[PDB]
């Protein structure tokens, strides 16, 4: 999902790359560096936003999103969720779920 012209929860709700990129994306397997036995939940991920980003936009707002019609007022509940879930990075995870 880290490449220009793509979509997905990361490409749309984390970090948008414009269709006219000039540059390089490079990553390496961090299984033995970032995973712990009990799960490394220090890396947080959003699934919900009001709208898609603009390229190179960074939103660190933690505002609780209103899934329903009633306002949340910063309090979770019915149809109210935090932006950030945690990722279960473990050394026994499969390649797809590895860091």
């Amino acid at each position, epitope marked *: 999902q880290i490449a220009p012209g793509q979509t997905g929860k990361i490409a749309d709700y984390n970090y948008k790359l414009p269709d006219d990129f000039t540059g390089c994306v490079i990553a390496w397997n961090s299984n033995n560096l970032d995973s712990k036995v*009990g*799960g490394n*939940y*220090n890396y947080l991920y959003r699934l919900f936003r009001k709208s898609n980003l603009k390229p190179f936009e960074r939103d*660190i*707002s*933690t*505002e*609780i999103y209103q899934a329903g019609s009633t306002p949340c007022n*910063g*309090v*979770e*509940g019915f149809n109210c969720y*935090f932006p950030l879930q*945690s990722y279960g990075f473990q050394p026994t995870n499969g390649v797809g779920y590895q860091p």
Partner: nanobody
Amino acid sequence: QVQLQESGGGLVQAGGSLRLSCAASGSIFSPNTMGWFRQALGKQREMVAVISSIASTQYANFVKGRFTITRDNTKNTVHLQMNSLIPEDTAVYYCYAVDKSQDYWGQGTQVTVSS
């Protein structure tokens, strides 16, 4: 070296009250986010609460309506009011500066409640 000082825990009987504090020094650029996280021996970090620069307060469903965060703009510090305590709250807490760059965690505050 961004350093956050933790204080205000200890031993309290069921139903008591405490006031924890994280005071932040170092870089901590203006758009920061101060959170508090729970860990009991045998579990991982449980997210307790969060305040951003917007001053909005966010709390988990575990402790609904029982704990509060107070924000001090002058010293940019945070005080967590621990009220209506219950032995399910027996867990060391750590506070978390989201900031804009490298994140920094706490040294811990022992919170114990039992009878």
